[PDB]
Design a protein around this ligand. Sequence first.
Ligand SMILES: [Ca+2]
Ligand SMILES: [Ca+2]
Ligand SMILES: [Ca+2]
Length: 184
Amino acid sequence: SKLRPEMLQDLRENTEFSELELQEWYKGFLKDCPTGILNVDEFKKIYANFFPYGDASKFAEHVFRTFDTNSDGTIDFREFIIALSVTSRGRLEQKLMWAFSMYDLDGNGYISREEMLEIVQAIYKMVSSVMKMPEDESTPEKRTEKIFRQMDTNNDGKLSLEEFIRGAKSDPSIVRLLQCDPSS
Ligand SMILES: [Ca+2]
Ligand SMILES: [Ca+2]
Ligand SMILES: [Ca+2]
């Protein structure tokens, strides 16, 4: 019912959750996923709460690939909570590291254009029914077109991690966030 003391400490180190929150998350996790393992179909049902199932499905699949760090087809409680912790309470630097690890489809250390386009397409499909887009990045190809041509510094047609991180920071939602840096 409850995390072992040895387990608990490993997760306090690798997440930004308190012990109480970890115990509460674990209980609730087993509550909702009795096997102790989340598979892809389950993960799609989670996303389907927030956006329509069919639409959200391909994005969900990519997220799952990334959460599933050992890459076996399921997510244990550890992979879940660590992924949750990073994405929801991580440093900005390490959020983008994780986002990069998602876009780099074949895990070679570079995002190719066709890797980018693919993710961007999935985000657009999930969202299509409910958010209405800017004007110039209001099509996956157009967007992928903006991103590369703002982020590919050395022009090899690939994004390195450092290119990725630097460029993301001129996203408006980051430009906003950064105005809240408590270093004033
Ligand atoms: Ca796994
Ligand atoms: Ca790649
Ligand atoms: Ca490059």
